[PDB]
Amino acid sequence: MRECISIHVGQAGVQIGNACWELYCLEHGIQPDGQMPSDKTIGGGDDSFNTFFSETGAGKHVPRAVFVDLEPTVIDEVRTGTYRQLFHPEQLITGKEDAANNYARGHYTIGKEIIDLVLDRIRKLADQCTGLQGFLVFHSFGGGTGSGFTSLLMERLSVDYGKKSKLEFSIYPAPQVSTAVVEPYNSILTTHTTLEHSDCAFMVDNEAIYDICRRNLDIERPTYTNLNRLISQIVSSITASLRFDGALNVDLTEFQTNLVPYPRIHFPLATYAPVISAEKAYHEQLSVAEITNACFEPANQMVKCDPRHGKYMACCLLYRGDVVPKDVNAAIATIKTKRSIQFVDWCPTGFKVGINYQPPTVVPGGDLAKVQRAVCMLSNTTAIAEAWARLDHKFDLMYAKRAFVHWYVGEGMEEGEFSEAREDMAALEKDYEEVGVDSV
Amino acid sequence: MREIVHIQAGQCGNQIGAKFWEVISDEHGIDPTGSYHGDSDLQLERINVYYNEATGNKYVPRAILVDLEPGTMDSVRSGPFGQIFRPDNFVFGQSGAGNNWAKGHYTEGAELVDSVLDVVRKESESCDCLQGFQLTHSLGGGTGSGMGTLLISKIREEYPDRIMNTFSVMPSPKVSDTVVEPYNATLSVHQLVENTDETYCIDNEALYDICFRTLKLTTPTYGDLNHLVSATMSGVTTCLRFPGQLNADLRKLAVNMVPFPRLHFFMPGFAPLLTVPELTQQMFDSKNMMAACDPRHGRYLTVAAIFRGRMSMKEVDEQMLNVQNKNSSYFVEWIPNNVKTAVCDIPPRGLKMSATFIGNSTAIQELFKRISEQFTAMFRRKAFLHWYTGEGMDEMEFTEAESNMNDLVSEYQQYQDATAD
Amino acid sequence: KREHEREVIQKAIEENNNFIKMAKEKLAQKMESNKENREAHLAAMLERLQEKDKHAEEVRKNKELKE
Ligand SMILES: Nc1nc2c(ncn2[C@@H]2O[C@H](COP(=O)(O)OP(=O)(O)OP(=O)(O)O)[C@@H](O)[C@H]2O)c(=O)[nH]1
Ligand SMILES: Nc1nc2c(ncn2[C@@H]2O[C@H](COP(=O)(O)OP(=O)(O)O)[C@@H](O)[C@H]2O)c(=O)[nH]1
Ligand SMILES: COC(=O)Nc1nc2ccc(C(=O)c3cccs3)cc2[nH]1
Ligand SMILES: [Ca+2]
Ligand SMILES: [Mg+2]
Numbered sequence: 001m002r003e004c005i006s007i008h009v010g011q012a013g014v015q016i017g018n019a020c021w022e023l024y025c026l027e028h029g030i031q032p033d034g035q036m037p038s039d040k041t042i043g044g045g046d047d048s049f050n051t052f053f054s055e056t057g058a059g060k061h062v063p064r065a066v067f068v069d070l071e072p073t074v075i076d077e078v079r080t081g082t083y084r085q086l087f088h089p090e091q092l093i094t095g096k097e098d099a100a101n102n103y104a105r106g107h108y109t110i111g112k113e114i115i116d117l118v119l120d121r122i123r124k125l126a127d128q129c130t131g132l133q134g135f136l137v138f139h140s141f142g143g144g145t146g147s148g149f150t151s152l153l154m155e156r157l158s159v160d161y162g163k164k165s166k167l168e169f170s171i172y173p174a175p176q177v178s179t180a181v182v183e184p185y186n187s188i189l190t191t192h193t194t195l196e197h198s199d200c201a202f203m204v205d206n207e208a209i210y211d212i213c214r215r216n217l218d219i220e221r222p223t224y225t226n227l228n229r230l231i232s233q234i235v236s237s238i239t240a241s242l243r244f245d246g247a248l249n250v251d252l253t254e255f256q257t258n259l260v261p262y263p264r265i266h267f268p269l270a271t272y273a274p275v276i277s278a279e280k281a282y283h284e285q286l287s288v289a290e291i292t293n294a295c296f297e298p299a300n301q302m303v304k305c306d307p308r309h310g311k312y313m314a315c316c317l318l319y320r321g322d323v324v325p326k327d328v329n330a331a332i333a334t335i336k337t338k339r340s341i342q343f344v345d346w347c348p349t350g351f352k353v354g355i356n357y358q359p360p361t362v363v364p365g366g367d368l369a370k371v372q373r374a375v376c377m378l379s380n381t382t383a384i385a386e387a388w389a390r391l392d393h394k395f396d397l398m399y400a401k402r403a404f405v406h407w408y409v410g411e412g413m414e415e416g417e418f419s420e421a422r423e424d425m426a427a428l429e430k431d432y433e434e435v436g437v438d439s440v
Numbered sequence: 441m442r443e444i445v446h447i448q449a450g451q452c453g454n455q456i457g458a459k460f461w462e463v464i465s466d467e468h469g470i471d472p473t474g475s476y477h478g479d480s481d482l483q484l485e486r487i488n489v490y491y492n493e494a495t496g497n498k499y500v501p502r503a504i505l506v507d508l509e510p511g512t513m514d515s516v517r518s519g520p521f522g523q524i525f526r527p528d529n530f531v532f533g534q535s536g537a538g539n540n541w542a543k544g545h546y547t548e549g550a551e552l553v554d555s556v557l558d559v560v561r562k563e564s565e566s567c568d569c570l571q572g573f574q575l576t577h578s579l580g581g582g583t584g585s586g587m588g589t590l591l592i593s594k595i596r597e598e599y600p601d602r603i604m605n606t607f608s609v610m611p612s613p614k615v616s617d618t619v620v621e622p623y624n625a626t627l628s629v630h631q632l633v634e635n636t637d638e639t640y641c642i643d644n645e646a647l648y649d650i651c652f653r654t655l656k657l658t659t660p661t662y663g664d665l666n667h668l669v670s671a672t673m674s675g676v677t678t679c680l681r682f683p684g685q686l687n688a689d690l691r692k693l694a695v696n697m698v699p700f701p702r703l704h705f706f707m708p709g710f711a712p713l714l715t716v717p718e719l720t721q722q723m724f725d726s727k728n729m730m731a732a733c734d735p736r737h738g739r740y741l742t743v744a745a746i747f748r749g750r751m752s753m754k755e756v757d758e759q760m761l762n763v764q765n766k767n768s769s770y771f772v773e774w775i776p777n778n779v780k781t782a783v784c785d786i787p788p789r790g791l792k793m794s795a796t797f798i799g800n801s802t803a804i805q806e807l808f809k810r811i812s813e814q815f816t817a818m819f820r821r822k823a824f825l826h827w828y829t830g831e832g833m834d835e836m837e838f839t840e841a842e843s844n845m846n847d848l849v850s851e852y853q854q855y856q857d858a859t860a861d
Numbered sequence: 862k863r864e865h866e867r868e869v870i871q872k873a874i875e876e877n878n879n880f881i882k883m884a885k886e887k888l889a890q891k892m893e894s895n896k897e898n899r900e901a902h903l904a905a906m907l908e909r910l911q912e913k914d915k916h917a918e919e920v921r922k923n924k925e926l927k928e
Contacts, residue, residue: 011687073687096569100691108895159885163877175777176757179686181696181742184776197884221753394776397860401774403699412899546920597910600903832924 001131004051004242005122006065009150010106011074012140012171014067015224019232019363020138021063022083024052024243026361027236033085034060048245054128064129066091066121068153070110070145071098090121099144103186104411106148107193115152119160126161133253134165134199136239141190142173142183151193158197165253167200169235172303172387174207177224182404184394185418192421195428200256200266202238203387204231205303212300216275217367229366234272234302237318237376240356248325250318250354258314258352259380264431265313269384270302271295271377274369281369288327288373289334292317295377296339303387308340310383311436315341315351321359321373328353344382345438385432392425441488442689443567444680445560446503446574449591450537450584452609453577454505454512455662456642459670460576461501462521464490464681466789467674472521474498482786485683492566504529504559506591508548508583509536529563531556537582541624542831544586553590560595572603572637572690576673579628580611580621580644589631596635603690605638607673610731610807612645613814615665620824622814623838629808630841632705633848637694639705640676640798642669643807645732654713654727672708672730674788675796678746684784697742697800699775702848703855705804707731709797716751720759723797724767731807738803738856740771743779749793753783773860802856805849812845 008017028049030036036059039045043057053061063086069075072094078084079092095114099105126132135157140146157166173183194201209230213222217230241252260266273294274286294300295317298307319328332351335341343349360374398404399418409415448457465471468487469478475497476484491499503525505516510532516522517530535548543549564570573595577584592604608628611621632639647668651660679686679693698704708730711722723745726734747756760781764771771778788794818824819838829835 071687097571098689098692100689100695102691102695104895108892109899112892155884155888159881159888162881178777179688179696179780179782181699181775181778181780221757397774397776398699400860401699401855401858403775404695406701407695407698409898410902412895412897412902414894414898542920546917547924550917550921593910593913597907600906830924830927832920832922832927834923 001046001129002051002133002242003064003129003131004133004136004239005125005129006052006063006136006138007122007153008065008067009137009139009153010069010143010146012143012146013138014069014074014078016138016169016171016228016231016235017065017067018078018081018083019228020235021065021086023232023236023361023363024063025083025086026363027358028053028243030061032083034062036061049243051133051242052239062086062088063091064125066093066118066125068093068114068118068149069098070095070106070114070149072096090124093118093121099148101142101180101182101186102144102407102411103148103189104408104413106144106146107152108148108413109411111149111152115149115156118153119156123160132164134167136167136169138169140171140173141187142171142178142180144186146171147186147190151190154194154197165199166197168194168198168202170201170203172203172205172391174205174210176210177206177222177227182407184391184398185404185408187391188395188425189417189421192424195264195424198266200260200268202270203267203303203384204234204270205387208302208304212275213367215299217277219367226367229363229368230275233360233368233374234270234376236360237272237320237374238270238378240320240358241318241354244356244358246355246357248355248357250352255316255318255352255354255378258316259378261313261347261380261435262431264428265380265435267384268378269305269307269381271300271379272302273300273375274371275300276369276371277367278369281371286371286373288323289331291373291375292328292331293335295375296335296341303384305381305383305386307379307381307383310381312341312343312379312381313347313435314380316378317351317353318376318378319353319355319373320375321357321371323355323373325353325355328355344436382432382436385429388425388429388432392422392429395422441568442486443502443570444489444572444574444690445563445567445570446490446501447506447560447591448503448576449506449588450577450581451507451512452581453575453584453588454507454516456607456609456666456669456673457503457505457576458516458519458521459666460673461503461524463670463674463789464677465521465524467786468681470499470524472524474500474524482682486681489680500524500526502563504531504556504563506531506556506587508533508544508552508587510534529559531559537586539618539620539624540582540827540831541586541627542828542833544582544588545590545627546833547831549583549587549590553587553594556591557594557598561598564599570599570602572605573599575604575606577606578609578611579625580609580616580618581624585624585628589628589635592631592635603694604636605640605690606632606636607640607642608632610641610643610645610811612643612648614648615644619818620827622811622818623824623828625811626815626841626845629811629848630844633702633844637690637698637704640708641705641731641804641807642672642708643731645810646730649732650713650727668710668730671788672710672796675710675746675748675794676708676798678748678784678796679782682784682786685782696780697744697798699741700851700855702851703741703800707733707735707799707801707804709799711795711797712791714793716755717759719747719793719795720756720763723795724763728797729799731804732810733801733803733806735799735801735803736770737806738801738852740799740801741775741778741855742800743771744798745779745781746796747781747783747793748795749787749791750785751783751793756781756783772855772858774858802852805852808845808849812842812849815842
């Protein structure tokens with residue numbers, strides 16, 4: 001058992017969902033029609049891939065997933081795309097009019113009209129689980145649906161599913177691939193609202209992904225298609241421990257025990273390696289030592305920040321492919337005596353290590369080279385607070401003049417929700433500062 | 441789908457309206473019969489935004505043609521693509537407003553406005569999910585100005601949660617001799633500032649100065665002025681009519697462009713009148729603006745620019761970065777990332793690449809100051825004031841419209857002088 | 862020790878229920894506050910449009926008491 005239900009909210013959430021589930025299918029040998037030849041137990045099973053896939057009597061393997069958007073055109077591409085047979089029509093939910101990059105519309109005006117239907121469809125997935133573990137919520141910070149509706153959904157999920165775990169994959173706004181101006185507002189609002197209802201959240205900075213695609217994959221001007229394929233690999237590395245088995249496999253929940261020292265401190269920094277093109281990977285093996293060392297090169301982080309100017313509270317290494325502990329241990333020993341790695345004084349310094357033997361897969365016609373071994377580092381660093389600081393500052397600049405606020409007030413919100421949300425963010429930044437001060 | 445309901449009022453509104461439909465029908469590949477004969481499915485992807493599907497193989501503009509005089513109605517019916525418009529959507533009076541705003545807003549127009557709303561309601565209710573309305577009109581006349589703003593007030597009463605955008609043509613002595621126009625403009629602005637989401641200030645003064653000094657056209661015709669207008673209107677609606685980088689309806693576009701409800705008056709621009717650096721420099725140039733204002737006399741609150749044609753996307757990103765860097769002072773610092781760009785693969789007809797510019801600049805106050813100057817020069821003498829009191833208006837309504845536009849100007853000045861610290 | 866064991870799991874139940882309760886209440890209060898504000902905002906907008914209609918008939922009336 002131990003099923004996980006994925007929920008994809010808004011354009012960013014949905015389209016990243018496409019990338020992930022396509023990648024999952026390739027990893028498990030699941031065809032676009034849902035058929036999986038290597039699976040001999042027809043109509044059910046308790047295999048590791050069953051955490052993410054349910055099974056019909058006709059042998060179809062169905063994602064434990066709901067797609068939600070307040071506007072239909074993004075999800076419509078899923079309904080008519082390559083993997084349309086994968087999903088039951090009731091897993092794909094759309095309204096007619098989006099939130100127009102307005103949190104208020106996503107959380108209130110438009111969201112309330114569809115939230116009951118969404119909870120019903122999620123309930124129908126939960127009822128088919130023999131031991132539901134929790135949820136995975138994919139969304140942007142900047143969208144009106146990604147921010148507003150997600151926080152509404154997270155609030156309702158806490159009511160309907162008690163303390164059942166809820167994890168986030170959140171897209172942090174970058175101007176390079178955005179045409180919105182009010183995203184700092186939506187970002188601060190959803191973070192404040194969701195903070196109590198999320199157990200762990202993986203922020204993905206679009207600028208970090210954009211840079212990596214440009215510098216490492218030599219993509220002149222990355223698209224959402226380019227970003228999502230990279231993001232899906234990081235998401236895959238993180239969920240791999242839930243979907244595959246293995247002696248040296250360590251479950252995500254065990255890493256979570258180390259990553260979250262206080263409820264509010266639940267934002268791990270992800271670093272992934274190797275990201276390399278086919279052209280450059282030819283005749284060039286990337287050893288365990290080489291990719292491990294790349295985890296401490298800030299250019300490979302999912303979020304722009306400098307851990308070398310912060311403190312560590314946890315460090316996890318999630319390997320996949322041709323990797324054995326002996327090589328890991330040696331690589332780590334080298335790094336510990338050559339890197340700027342400093343822990344807070346109230347936390348042990350050892351690196352928690354996981355290894356899945358099944359190697360990384362690539363999507364056909366993608367940009368990433370197929371490699372024999374990859375690694376995702378999940379660290380808890382005070383430096384992640386830099387991402388809050390940049391966002392909060394953009395917020396302050398606009399809010400001082402009350403720019404764009406009338407759009408929010410017009411949909412029923414009050415200025416008091418803004419200041420309250422901002423104060424939570426100020427306290428959050430101070431929390432990250434306080435955990436880094438040495439003990440008495 | 442995502443409907444826009446189009447409305448054109450008065451003479452100016454109807455002829456720039458007809459030009460708009462000609463240009464976009466050409467782009468979407470439909471002929472005056474209403475039949476599609478294109479080559480790309482990208483022409484039909486969002487065909488529903490401005491067209492209803494009808495009889496077998498036929499596309500009919502979701503447009504409503506309005507005027508207090510029947511003259512221009514026949515002109516459109518006789519003009520190219522005249523047989524593509526829905527006959528019932530022609531709503532005309534016999535009256536003729538005679539450049540009297542009061543006649544348009546309170547008297548003649550008020551009697552006709554109901555049958556107009558009837559056609560609006562019929563188009564709107566047939567809509568899968570109406571995203572909003574757009575109005576083409578001038579502010580200097582009587583019908584498009586007076587009845588147009590009355591129509592807006594009435595539509596917002598039945599559709600208070602729909603987007604209302606106008607393409608408003610601003611009066612200039614260089615184009616029209618009519619003396620009373622600063623009255624009609626000031627009265628209309630008093631309405632637009634309260635009841636619209638976006639107003640594209642199509643300034644006849646700027647249209648004239650472009651045709652004359654740039655296009656080197658001695659004594660320019662309305663056809664010359666409107667060619668610029670059609671090219672601009674085509675540009676500002678490109679992201680709505682073609683699938684591209686933007687997944688944005690009228691509301692989302694307004695949300696990211698209008699930081700303050702009253703400050704929704706955009707100065708549009710076009711280029712050219714070519715390399716990407718050249719295109720980008722021109723579109724930020726004061727000579728290429730469709731509103732007679734110098735952007736370097738104020739600051740940009742928000743900016744949107746649409747590039748069209750097959751060009752280097754990387755180069756566009758770099759040139760936009762370059763322009764903002766070299767012109768940093770002219771963008772307000774307290775709105776981060778306020779300059780946004782989109783690119784459409786499909787170029788306009790005749791140009792292998794172009795650029796449409798939408799600026800929300802505090803320098804638009806210069807346009808309102810010009811009108812205010814001409815207005816106040818009449819109102820001191822109460823010149824021609826009896827044409828308005830005659831219809832039942834009071835002088836106070838003139839004072840209020842004057843001071844409201846004065847407030848608008850001071851408000852633009854407020855945010856122009858604001859700093860981050 | 863047995864009584865302490867019971868009190869621990871009872872506390873865990875009480876806290877989880879309290880979290881669920883307060884979340885349900887705070888959300889219901891937020892949706893209600895939002896519904897009121899939005900309605901008041903739209904009501905104010907319509908009332909403004911209604912004075913303009915009242916003004917328009919006082920204008921047309923003024924014109925007949927002109928003759
Ligand atoms: N990485 C990535 N980011 C995306 C993608 N799509 C949108 N975004 C980002 O999401 C933000 C905008 O939010 P959206 O997800 O598009 O909006 P939404 O959730 O659909 O909410 P609405 O306002 O109602 O449309 C911007 O910062 C985009 O850069 C995507 O496919 N991949
Ligand atoms: N750019 C442009 N301006 C016009 C056109 N027709 C009229 N105008 C302007 O509109 C103003 C007069 O408004 P008009 O449309 O004649 O008033 P109405 O028909 O009674 O509503 C004058 O300032 C004209 O310069 C046109 O085709 N193009
Ligand atoms: C009919 O009314 C309008 O088309 N309104 C409108 N408002 C707009 C704002 C922006 C844009 C646009 O094309 C963008 C280019 C780059 C970022 S947005 C287009 C817009 N169109
Ligand atoms: Ca099975
Ligand atoms: Mg969306």
